[PDB]
Every structure is written in C-alpha cells, then in structure tokens.
C-alpha cells in the first residue's frame, strides 16, 4: 500500500494505489484507499482494512464537528480516543489526513505527525513515493496532481505491495 | 478448504468442497460449506467452523434487513461489528458472500474485499480454483455453474486440504 | 487418550481408555472417559479434564431437553454456546457424542463434525483406533462391540498416551 | 517441591518437603506445604505460592461445607470454580487432597484425578517419592508414616528442588 | 507418505503410496517408493527423495554383499555409515527394508528398529496403515499381500499426505 | 517467480516470468529464467539466482552427454551429484527441465519429480499457473503455446512475486 | 527409556526396558538396551539409537583392551574421544557401564560419573527406577536382581517413555 | 547505507553516502563506499564492511583480467566463486558494479542482476534514492551527476541509516 | 529522541531535538518535545507520542494544582495514577520534568527518578547528551543554556534517532 | 558447583563442593573438583566435566614446565592454545588455578582473569562463597582454611547446584 | 568496558578502564586493556579476552612490519585475515588502534573504521566517553591526556560495565 499527499500552488492532492494483498496473492487491484471527510474539505487516506478505517473515520468526522472543523485539534483528539478507547484500540491501521493547509499522519499509538515539507506518505511504499515527490517538487514546476500520479506510479514499480491503479482526490 | 464464486450472464454461482481436516487426518468429506441467506437472494460460504459461520450469518441476515438488502452496506456493517463486538471478535471463520451484482470477502480483521473480476475465492485452495475460473471465463463461453464445477475439481486435485465433494448454490 | 465410536447394523458402541497423563508420567490408568446422557440414549466421551467435561455435558443435557432429543440441533447449539458464553469459553475438552443414528465431534472452536462413515474417534490415539476400526468394518463381519474393543486395544498398543483399560457403553 | 500421600492400614499420611526456591537459590528450607482442612479431617498439600494455595484452600473449605463433607463432590466443584472464576483462574498451583478413603490431585485446568493406587504425589520431585513409596508398599510392612518419611527423604536426595526437611500430617 | 511391510506365512510383502507433496500441493500421484534389492531377495521402501534413497540403497547393497546377506548386520552397518560418513550424513530419507525373516526401520540418526510384530510402517501415514494391518492380521486369515492392499487403502483415505496409488513388491 | 511447462499433442512449451525480487522491492522485470540445453532439445527453467542456475545447468549438460541424452537418467544423476558434491550442495535454485517426452522438477534435496499430467510448474506462482493450465488443457482445444501464455499471465496477475513479462521456449 | 544397575552381595545387575518411541508412537517394545562388553565382564547400557551406541561401544571395547581392563581408565579415555573425535562427537546418546566393583555414567560432554551409592540409572525413567531401587536396598534384603526387576517395573508404570519388558544382564 | 548509479548521455555516475552505523550510533560520517576498479574503467559500490568488500573486489579485479574486461562475464564468475568458495562464502555484503554500458547488482547468493532501467541502487536507502532518480530521469534534463547528488541527498533525508556526505565517482 | 535538562547556578534549562522516526525513516525533523507547565514554572519534555504526552501533562497540571506546585508530590501522585488508572495505563511516553529546584524522570512503570547531579536526560540519545553535559559542567564555566545546546548537538551527531533541531525552554 | 580460593598471610587454600547435577537431579554428591598440579605447587579446580578438566590440566602442566613454573605465563599460553587448538576448543570447563602468589580464572573464550583481592571463585555458587569469604577476610582474624570451609558451607546452603561435601587442598 | 583514544596537537592518547564482568558480578577492577605495539609507536586497546587480544595483536605486529608501518594498510590486512583465517575467525574481541595520525576500530566482521573526528571509542561505555571527549575538545584547550582522563571518569560513572580504574598510554 502507498498513500501520498502533495501540496503545491494552493492545491492539496492525495493519491492511493489499489492493491489488496493476502499473503502473497492479490485479492483486489482497484481498491479506493482515499476518501473525503468533513463535508468534502478533508482528504483521508488509510493503510489497513476497510472496516477499521471506516470506524476511525467515523470518530474523526465526529471530532471535526465537535471542534469547529479544526483539523489539528480533531487529529489530536482522535489520536487520544484511538489510544485509550477499548474499541478503537483494537483497530489496526495508519491514517493520513489533510486539508488545504495542514497534513497529519495519525497512528493508534497516539501519534499525530505533520511532516515539515510539502509532501507526506504512509504505507509500505510510502517512502518510495515520497522520495519521488520530493524530487519533482524541488526540480520541476509540475502540479501537485501530476507529481502524485508520477510518484505513485514509481512506487508501484518498485514495491511488490503497491500497484499502478491510482485513485486521486483533491481539496 | 475451497469456496469459489463466479458471476456470469447475470447469474451468480458459489461452490464449496466438503473436506474437514484436523492435523493431517481427514475427519469428514461431505461438509456443506455453502448456504443461501436473505430470502434466497444471497449466497454465503465459509472457511471455518459451523458455529462461527452460523453466528456470523445470523448477524449478517440482520444487517441485510436493516440496510434494505444492500449487500455492500451489510457487509461493511458486519465487518465493523465483527471487529468491535466482544462476542463476534472471538469468531475466526473467513466468509465469502455474493448476490447478482456483488461479491465480498469478509474477515474478522475488518476486511471487506470485492475483487475486480467476475470470480473470487477463499480457503487454502481458493487461489487454485480462482486461477482455473479466470482461465475458463476468459477462454470459453461456459456458464458460471459449469466453470465453478470445473474449477473446484481442479482445486481439489491440487490442494491436500480440498477434496472433490462439491456443493453448489446459485442465484 | 482415545475415544472411539463405531456403528454397525443399528448398534452404536463407544469405548474410551483410562490413562491420565501429566507431562510424561501416568497419574491414573483406570479413568472413565465415557458416559451415557439424555436418559440413556446418548453416548458421550471426552478427551480432557473431568470438570470441563461435566460442565459441558450438563449444558449438552439442557440442549437435548430444549430441542427434544435432536442430537444435531443440540450439538450445534452447544457449540454456539461454547463459543460465545464467557464461562464455557474457558473449557478446552474435546467431545464426541452419538445416538442410534448420528455421531458428532464438538470442540471449543465452534466445530460440529459428523464423519461420513460408521466410525469416529477423538484424542491423541483416535486416528489409530479409527484406522483399525475401518479395517475391521470393511473386511470382517465382526460386531460394533468387538470392533471397538479390538481397535481400542491396538490404539493403546501404539500410542504412549493411550492405555488398554477400556470402558464401553452402548445404545 | 515434593508432596506425597500414602494410605495403609486405615491411616492416611501426607508429607511435604520444606524447600522454597527462587531461580537457583534457596530462600527457605522449613516450609510447611501440608495443611489440614475440613475440621482436621482432610489433608491438603500444595505446589505453589502460599497466597495462591490459601485462596484455593478457602474456596475448598467452602465447597466442603456446602456439599456435606463430600470430598469427591467438593474437589470437582473447586476444579470448576478454579477453571472459570476470573479470580482463581489467575492462581497458579497444583493441589493434592485426601481424607481417610479418597485421594485427589486437582489442577487449574479442571482436573480432578484419583490415582488407582494407595499412593499419590505432586511437585517436581513427586514421581521420585512415588516410585519409592510404591516400592515400600509392595515389599515391606512399614506403616504409611514410615513409608512417607523414607520416600520423601529419597526424593530430597535426588531432586535439586526438594530438600530433606519433611513436614508430616495425618487423618 | 506411507510404506507398509507385512510378513505372513513365510511371505513378506511391502507396499507404498504414490503421493509427492510440496507445501500444500500434490506434485505427483504415481511415485514408486518401493524397490527390490539384494538380487530380488530384499524389499526396500523409502519416505524421502529419490537421490537420497538411491545413494542409501547403493551403500546398503554393498553392506549386504559384504556381510553375506545378513540383513541384520547390513542394516546396522549402514546405519553406522549413515551416521559417520560426511556424504551420507546429508541424506535425510527414512528407510524400511525387509526379507523373509526380518524387518528394519533405518534412520540417519543411527536408528535400526525391528518392531516385535509381523507388520511395520514408516511415513506420515505409517501408523494408520499399521493399525489397519495389525487388526487384519489378528482377525482374519488374509495373506500378507491382501492385508497390505487393504491397509494402504485405509491409510490413504485418512492421511492428506498419502494417496490410493499403491505399488506392491513381494519376496 | 513462475516457471511453467505444458505438453499437448507432441508440443512441449516452457514459459517463465521476468520479475526479480529482493525483500519486497522489484529489482528487474525482464529476467530470462528459461533456456534451451542439450543442443536445443531440452527446455530448462529455474527459480533462483543465475549463478546457481548456470553451474547446475552446466552439470546437467554433462550428464546429458554422459548418458546419451537420456533425460530421466541425466536428471537423477544430477540430483545425486547435487546432493553429494561439496560445491553443488551450496546451490539452492529449483529446476524444471523437459524434452519432447519427459518433465522433471529437480531440487538440492535430492528430489527428481515428474508430475503425472501434461503440465508442471515451479516457483511461488507455479500452483496458480498450473491450475489455469490444467483448466485450459481439459476444457479447451487450445495449443500448449497458447495455454502457457494465458496461464503465465494469470499467475502474474495473482502472485506479487510473478510479473507479466514472459519468455517462452519450445521443443 | 530406563536403564538401572544395582550392586548387592558381590553381584552387579543391570536392567533396561524395551520401548522405542518415535514422536508419540511405540515402534518396538522388546528392545535390548543392555549389552555385555570386555569379554562378558562389563555391563553396558545405553539411552539412544542402536548405531550410535554400537560405535561408542566399539571404541569402549578398544579402550578396555588398551588399558588392561581398567574400567575407570577406559571410561575416562572414551569420554575424551567422544568429546573431541569429529566422528563420535556427532553421536547422541548416554551410557551406563559397570563391572563387579565400579559403575560409571558417561556422556558426550566429557562426563564420567560414578554415583556414591550401590545404584545408578539413566534415561527418562532413570530417576524413578533409582528412587525405587534405593528404597528396596535400604529396607529389604532382596537380591540385586529382584530389586532391578521391581524398580524397572515401577518405572514402566510411571513413565510413558519406558515399558515393562525388561532385559536383565549380570556380571 | 545508500549506493546509487545513474546512466545518462553516455556518462555513468555512482554515488554513496558516508555513514557507518553500529547499533544506533554513528561511528563515521565520511565513509567512501564507492571505488574504481578495472584500471579506472569500472565503478564499484558496496554495502557492508571494508574488509569483506576489499576481498571481493580483489577477486572481481582478477575476474576482469581473466575474461578480457568483460563486465558481464566477470560478474557472473565472481558470483559463482562468492557462492561456493569457502572463504568468500563467509563474506557478508552486497555489491553494485557498472561500466559505461552495463550495471549489475551482485550478491553472495549467486545473484547477478541488471535492472531494466538507467538507474540502480542498493543498501537500506537504495529504494529511496532510486525512486528519486527515476523521477528526475523521466521529468528533467539534469545530468547523471546532478541526479545522483539530488537523489542521494533525498535518501539521506529519509533513511536514518544513510547520511548527506556523498562521494561520487564516474567512468 | 533526546531530552536534556541541566541546572547551573540557579538556572534550569531543558532542550529536546525534533526528529520523529517510524521504523527506519524520519517523518518530521522539527518536532517540539519540550514545553512549559504550571504557569510557566515547570519545564516538561517527553520521549513518545504527542497524544500520550498531552494527556499525561494535563494530569500533571492537575496534580500541580492539587498539591500547591509541589513538584515532588505532583510527580509521585502522577506516577501512582499512571500506574493504576485504566486510561493512563495505556500511555507509554517517558517524561522528564523540572522546576527551579528539582528534576524528575517519570514512567508508566511507576518510576519517579531524580538524578543526584545537576543534569538529567531521557530518550535514546539521553546518555550521550548526559555524558557531554557532565563533562562541560565539571570542566568549564559555561552556563546551563550553552551546555544544553552543545550537549544536545553532540547527542544528535552520535545517535541516529536524534537530530540537531533543538527546542529550548528555561526557568 | 562452587570452587573457591582464598589467600591470607602467605597461605593459599582452595575448596570445591562435590555435587554433580544432570538436569534437575543430583547424580553424585562426593565429586573431587580440586587437585594439585605442578609438583604440588599449584592448586587447580574446575566447574565442568572430568574429561574436559583432565585434558586441560595436562596441557596446563606442560605449559608450567615449558615456562618454568611461571603461573601467569602458563595461564596465558594455555588460554591461547585453548582458543586456537582444534581439539581443546571443544572443551568447555571453567578453570581456577593458583599458587602461593597468583590466582587465575581461565576459560575457553580466551579469558585469563586474576581478581584484585585475596579471594576468587567460579561456578554457579562462586559469588555466594566469594561474598562470604570477603566478609570473613575483612571482619575476622580467621585463617584462609577456616574461611574457605565456612564460605563453601554457606554457598552450598544457598545454591541448589552446590552441596556441603567439600574437598580442600592447600599450598 | 571503555577504551577511548584522543588526538590533539600532534599527540595521541589512549585510555582504558579496568572492570571485568561476568554476568552481574565484577570479577576484577584493575584490568590493563591498553598496550603499545610497533616499537612503541602504536597504541592498541581491546574490549574482549586477553588471549583473543594477544593473538590479534601478534598478527597486527606482523602486518605493521610487512607494510612498512602503514597503520591504514596493516589494519585493513589484519581485518581481512581476521575474516578469512580459520584460527582468527574464532576470536571475538573488538580492537582500537592508533598512531600519531590515524585511528582505527577493527572488528572480526571485516570492519575497519576511522571516525572523522579527533576522538574514537569502543566498548559498552565508549559512546559516553566519546560524547564527553568531543565536548571537551570543542570547548577547552585541554590536552589529549587531560581529556582522556576526564572523559573516562565520566564514562565509568554512567556505565555499570565500566569503572574508574584507568590505564593510559601515549604516543
Ligand atoms: Na508493484
Ligand atoms: Na485434494
Ligand atoms: Na499405550
Ligand atoms: Na534435594
Ligand atoms: Na489421502
Ligand atoms: Na504479479
Ligand atoms: Na510406561
Ligand atoms: Na539520514
Ligand atoms: Na542524529
Ligand atoms: Na545446595
Ligand atoms: Na561504572
């Protein structure tokens, strides 16, 4: 799995591959690992099972409403719940969320991390797409969308756990 | 074990073998691992114990009624419960359900997977039945029922955990 | 431990050895691992501790009453309870039950297995007794009672966890 | 640790060594691992910590009262509780109890075992004392008390986890 | 795999199945695991690879010639070599050899075992074929060949690693 | 990796994918894992390193010369050398060879296996290609060449260690 | 396995059971684990495979000849060889040897141990037979031979790895 | 560690970071992991200890001389030696070599791999530098040298086992 | 991560690096791991997730209020709550707090440690910063602020989990 | 095992216990683990097998001759031989030697250690005897002989691997 | 253990502690872990056994003479031998050598590391001594000898495996 988000020219674009692997066999190749939350204002990507992510996204949606759409506050509060709530604590997944100004990686270990760069990624192929994205951001004038398509494509080329069927969303 | 579902010409067929294994010994060769749910409109197969399957199918039936027969919604909600409910959380069977338009693999790990092809399978011999089904779907005009019959026979021939006693249900 | 059930010409016989092992030492050699339940119409054997067996058999007795002596129904409902009930879930014995027409292996993992043959067995020595039983069933005209005695003896001869002190019950 | 009980000439005698080991160092050499329960009518020995045994003995005392002093019934009921009660289930120890007519080994796994002989033993050195006791019972006319002293002494000689400071009680 | 030898009425017969398994898949179903050595006077079967078996049988043939056809001596000497020789020490197959009077199980661990019964077996399904053979030998007047045929069929039915394609040799 | 051989109506075809994986990253996607040996009469494929394969194929070539093109003899002698030779013993590739009449899987564990069917395969994706191949062989009139191409494609689609860049050789 | 030696009234008697176990199945029940060496003057027992013991006994025989029949010296020199010789060092077994005046336990770790008592034993059931032997030696006037028969019999009763078919030799 | 090689416009450039890590501490930050062989015509990079690499490079130099400067042949022959030579087989490292027309990754497992692209990399940070290099090669007109500097720099940013002190060589 | 506190001549300074590591990749390099609590009189740093830290610091703030700014009392009560509270028990961050007179390391294992020196540190790089800090405290006249900056730099230079982006707070 | 050496006022005394343990059973209680070497001028004790000790002591004797009784030189050269010699390298005993002026602990790992105090010890119980010895050396006027006896007794009292049967040698 | 080398003003100084630890007990506190080689022109320290160190230093001395005192060449060649030579390959000490211009850490894993700073260290406490040395070198004008003295004291204070008894050598 590879989820990548890139911000450039006031646009934030997030992409995700579509491969679902069980052991060493591909069960599905067109998975949609990127969704939209907060009334189409927040991008949300996930590395993990659908049900786990959905339950977490539900709690995240709630947090967004409760704290007036404050992404930073919502992310921290979700991390807290995910960490202590007996239910969510059993969920295994890694999240990547972002609006037009902030990006956060959130984990079940109480982590809320905003990389100090215009790009971030998670999943087994995350670092590959990220390296590519950082390269394109610093040496081309390509748009956020194009960088994501190209970086994700390169990640799929290298990682056996990530494919080339990329789904892209934007806010 | 091998459970295979094939969709063709608006018809959906599911087949399952009958072998039950404990360690290295075959305990039973005529198990029924396939049933019909949702008033005969849904096919359901399982890799696992009878009690686990029944407990899960009962919750699935409820999900179907609650969400107006929406297989996609019902599968997702069942997966969420399987992950949170302390009772279901102990059940370890692997499920395969389908109707005329969709197919879903559901696991106790919150996984809800719909392969992007007209065939899907679970169990130790699943991939063999699947490879055979794909080959037949793409190179013959055989019906969904004919393909399931022929694919299951091959899986039972290759996998030591799958036999040739097949039960078939159709919708 | 070896528990064996053989049915031949309307007669159903169950035999169990008496060896109780702790680590690598025999603590008792005359244990009774077989009994009659449901007003003398059901044969019940177990591979495990006596307290576990007693609690499970009591629940089985209740199921038999609630479902009007239906062995199949009773066995399935016991397995579902065994799998969901907070108390029973701690019980780890392996059970083998039979009446004049059906035979079921029941486990704490939700298993309810009826072998598709006229003999069934559980315990470390089960497979050996089963092999001997099938050989006699298919190549001699010996009665179920004789077969069980002879098969159990051979199992105790081969398995270090099974002895030759056999208890037999018939229905 | 070694706990041994021997019955001979209407007398039941139980002995236990006094060694308490932590890692490879002896912390105490005069431990009292044998107590009297049921108003001085039942002998009770234990391999394990004092607190664990005490809590179990308390529950055993209760069971004895509840079932009219029936040792067999009391032992089975304790085994059941020890197995399922969330509290006792956390206790780690092995028990050896006996009155003037019955002897039972009881474990946290629901086991209630009465050896088919006039002797029984538990603990790391149990089998050594037992072998000795069986030898003396079958080849001498020594009293139960003397057999216990000699057998325990031999166990202490052989096992590094059992010493020669023997405490003996009788009913 | 299952290799069974039965001695009866001065006649010795050895049978072997034909299944070859890699992981969970059957690679071949008609393997020949039984041969004749020592000028047609010795039966030899193996659980393991062809190259290993052949290398071992060649050394065994030499041992037979050297010790004047003494199966007992030849088996012991082969076992010693298998244990010391750096070349043979790498071979891991399990062997079963027999003539009109003796039977020996030989392993690379210096084991040379002659069971004290007129039947012996090796391989994953050996004990099942053995239990069946013992039952038939003690309850029928069937020949060594008939018993091997019937016992092997049963072993192949129970063991997922043994099939029904049997090769039989006799001396 | 997937190497597949299919024989139909006198034509023998071998196909192999081109993916080279190190850990979880693809290092090359156009590898040649199939070649012709013995003056163009023998098909040879391998799952492993190229240096291992070259050394083994060279020894195989020698065996073919020494035994006058006898594939069976050559395969067996190669396996014996592979198992005993101090040099070859360090080689861990898995081989698959075939001529116009025979097919053999050869391993460093002394295995020499000829499947009893008109198709054989090795490598992580072998079973999938095999299942697809058998399905097409038994339910279509497609040639060996077409079957291999189609089966290899399906194997690369399912297995994350096998890609779709196929090399084919025929005899 | 259980090997026991007892000295009393100028007579040294050594006994051994006959059970040979592979996993949890008895392959042979009349094994002869006690031999005579040094021209019928030295008793030699072994826990381990036949070939290993034989090779060690051969080297022991040699040592006895070399050092003029000095059992003590022969045992020490064998221990040295067993420890350093590349061949013997691969042998896995435990030995128990004795003449009319000395008893020694010898291991592949360079151990040569003479217990300070008139009895010694090795094997899984060794301590059980030893405890019994010590009991009979100190409380009866039974002969060495009878003590061995009774102690071994008791060991077979307790240990699942030792049986009641005892072979006895004397010097 | 990260070693990257890029070919563009008839120029082949190889770079390597300078970090040497022991546990979780940096012992050196200006390591030179890239050398020149074959009379300054071949680039050679290594992930592993200095001595191991040096010994391998020595053998590689020899192979280059022996086969007339044929990089492909030299690499294969080194792989063979590294695989079987008792000395080299003990060496633990991964190599990356290249001239102006070919690039090869060589391992101690007999692997000789030429990626099908104008870039290749090894070491823990290899895939990160590679992803970046592939991005720059396909979307900019930067020289091989600049791509290497930028890609390596990005790898150092991401991987904790790779730093920013890059050594670059060219042929 | 490295968090360091140094006190010299009434001045207490705390510094923390900014590297956030997931596995072996740096996700962020400018994290703020140090803050001021208790109305600007308490320095607080942490090695762990931000959500864990926030929850713990909030509880610490409460303790400070309840115990009238008594750092010792507050630290001890926080540790007791951390150890017993069902919520906090899931929090695994390591804390370091200090005011103008005391310094305490607090963990989820009930630890409350005040080093007996004028410097303290936590995190993977703590010991390195501590060593450097003590060296400067004892052999120079540098202020606490200068020492922290210099020590933190050296820690980031040696530890792969600590970087050079330092945040400093003083009281 | 415990071996202790104490030197006080020109007198050097070495004591060793006599317990020999195999697993968790005492096989002998009167072993001699201490001897005199170098014409009665060197005290030598060991924790290990007797064969290992004898071979090592013989080599030590040779070193003492070759280096003119220089204990330091002899101990170092023995350690170097122990570490490089193909034979000695298989020996795993731990040695303790001393003369009227020096004391050395020698191991197969090349260790040559002379404690900087007037007492030294090896074996599982060494530290206990050492603690007791130092206490008596520093707070009483007891002789070396008395101290060793008293310290060894206390060590045997605390350690389950050390008994109270002490052998003493003096120089 | 802690061995530290510091170069300053053309003077090179190496210091080492004297603690020797076995398990959790200090066996000696005045060990000499630092020596002078190459006619007093080279400093050599070690973390490991005396025999190992001496054997390695002897080979190092030879390397120095052979390569005309070239420390860099000698270190590399020693590392190669340590890796190939069957005798040295068993030595496991860690080495630290230096002269007026260079410093090298040498390991049995073929590692030859020269840190890019005027200080280096090995052993459990190395990093602490190193952090202290770097701090002093960059913030004072203290000599190499003064810094080593002060840094070693600090390392001994922090590490439980390093003490305050330091030996210092200079060149
Ligand atoms: Na991919
Ligand atoms: Na099958
Ligand atoms: Na038995
Ligand atoms: Na004892
Ligand atoms: Na089968
Ligand atoms: Na693929
Ligand atoms: Na027994
Ligand atoms: Na880095
Ligand atoms: Na760092
Ligand atoms: Na003791
Ligand atoms: Na210290």
UniProtKB/Swiss-Prot annotation, chains A, B, C, D, E, F, G, H, I, J, K:
GO terms for cellular component: cytoplasm; HslUV protease complex; proteasome core complex. InterPro entries: ATP-dep_Prtase_HsIV_su, Ntn_hydrolases_N, Proteasome_sua/b, Proteasome_suB-type. Its main location: cytoplasm. The keyword Glycoprotein does not apply. Na(+) binds at residues 156, 159, 162. Keywords: Allosteric enzyme, Cytoplasm, Hydrolase, Metal-binding, Protease, Sodium, Threonine protease. GO terms for biological process: proteolysis involved in protein catabolic process. SUPFAM superfamilies: N-terminal nucleophile aminohydrolases (Ntn hydrolases). Pfam families: Proteasome. Transmembrane segments: none annotated. It catalyses: ATP-dependent cleavage of peptide bonds with broad specificity. CDD domains: protease_HslV. It is an enzyme of class 3 (hydrolase). GO terms for molecular function: metal ion binding; threonine-type endopeptidase activity. Its EC number is 3.4.25.2. Allosterically activated by HslU binding. The keyword Iron-sulfur does not apply. The active site is at 1. PROSITE patterns: PROTEASOME_BETA_2. It is found in: Cytoplasm. According to PubMed:12646382 the propeptide is autoprocessed in 20% of the cases in the expression system (E.coli). PANTHER family: ATP-DEPENDENT PROTEASE SUBUNIT HSLV (PTHR32194:SF0), METALLOPROTEASE TLDD (PTHR32194). A double ring-shaped homohexamer of HslV is capped on each side by a ring-shaped HslU homohexamer. The assembly of the HslU/HslV complex is dependent on binding of ATP. Protease subunit of a proteasome-like degradation complex believed to be a general protein degrading machinery. Belongs to the peptidase T1B family. HslV subfamily. This is ATP-dependent protease subunit HslV. It comes from Thermotoga maritima (strain ATCC 43589 / DSM 3109 / JCM 10099 / NBRC 100826 / MSB8).
